[PDB]
Scaffold this active site. Structure first.
Site, PDB file in Angstrom:
ATOM      1  CG  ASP A  34      -2.147   0.919   1.043  1.00  0.00           C
ATOM      2  OD1 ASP A  34      -1.999   2.009   0.505  1.00  0.00           O
ATOM      3  OD2 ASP A  34      -3.270   0.582   1.485  1.00  0.00           O
ATOM      4  CG  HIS A  84      -8.971  -2.932  -1.421  1.00  0.00           C
ATOM      5  ND1 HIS A  84     -10.154  -2.515  -1.989  1.00  0.00           N
ATOM      6  CD2 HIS A  84      -8.588  -1.944  -0.578  1.00  0.00           C
ATOM      7  CE1 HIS A  84     -10.477  -1.332  -1.502  1.00  0.00           C
ATOM      8  NE2 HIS A  84      -9.548  -0.963  -0.642  1.00  0.00           N
ATOM      9  CG  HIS A 129      -6.683  -2.465   3.843  1.00  0.00           C
ATOM     10  ND1 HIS A 129      -6.018  -1.387   3.309  1.00  0.00           N
ATOM     11  CD2 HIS A 129      -7.995  -2.286   3.537  1.00  0.00           C
ATOM     12  CE1 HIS A 129      -6.883  -0.610   2.681  1.00  0.00           C
ATOM     13  NE2 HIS A 129      -8.090  -1.134   2.802  1.00  0.00           N
TER      14      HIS A 129
END
Ligand SMILES: [Zn+2]
Ligand SMILES: [Zn+2]
Lengths: 141, 141
Positions: free
Chosen positions: A31, A100, A102
């Site tokens: 990220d 997505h 994390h």
């Protein structure tokens, strides 16, 4: 908008990004707007906007890549703590409309994911109702 | 402590709990201390304390059950927003030392999961370093 979906752009090669892992149905990368050092993302290659739109085969592959990625995040001795977070809907803090996960290192009280955990009362009758609806919904997939 | 693990107690039948779904490697049920109405849990049957300790086959099955459960949580018309959260370490807000994925309905600005999202700067050199370490770690699983 798969057209205006930055993860689809990464997936097709229109925007560059160092690939941390790639499987048939899934991709991992870092990220670039992390909450903590080592914050990474695991995404399906398929443009599913929410987790409930993801295919079952894609779900198996993403679960496996998520587990592998967690071992990477846990570090050489496995001592690194972390949160796994996947958001579904903009009220639910989802920004990019593509699933997505994390994986966010929690190095510190002051960094990483910060969570508010205030519970509510639910009745036994309500729990039974939800359990029935959910199990029947799951049974027919 | 699998002995003092309440999810192992549920799994073996020492404490009752309405089962929302059950697969070979995983179980789902309602959270009796919910953040919002319809908050549920998906757990592996195996006592893994963190996600990185979970077996690859167990990871595939848990990913699939998680996706199925999200369809239940999304509701009859799929309009319900929600957060998926899995915590690894007590600094990371994990309380029971057994992997559990929360699927938490976000009905409201005032209820469900509340998240603090304050990003930090990471350098290109640091991102490359983490990407290398992670991909090599993942490559050898
Ligand atoms: Zn996309
Ligand atoms: Zn346990």
């Amino acid at each position: 908008m798969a057209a205006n979906c930055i993860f689809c752009k990464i997936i097709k090669g229109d925007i560059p990004c160092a690939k941390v892992a790639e499987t048939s149905k899934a991709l991992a990368f870092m990220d670039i707007n992390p909450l903590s050092r080592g914050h990474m993302l695991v995404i399906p290659k398929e443009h599913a906007s929410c987790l409930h739109e993801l295919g079952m085969e894609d779900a198996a592959d993403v679960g496996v890549l998520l587990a592998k990625a967690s071992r990477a995040v846990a570090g050489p001795d496995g001592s690194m703590q972390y949160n796994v977070l996947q958001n579904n809907g903009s009220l639910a803090h989802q920004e990019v409309p593509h699933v997505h996960f994390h994986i966010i290192p929690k190095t510190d009280e002051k960094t990483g994911l910060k969570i508010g955990w205030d519970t509510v009362k639910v009745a036994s009758d309500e729990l039974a109702e939800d359990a029935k609806r959910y199990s029947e919904a799951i049974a027919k997939i």
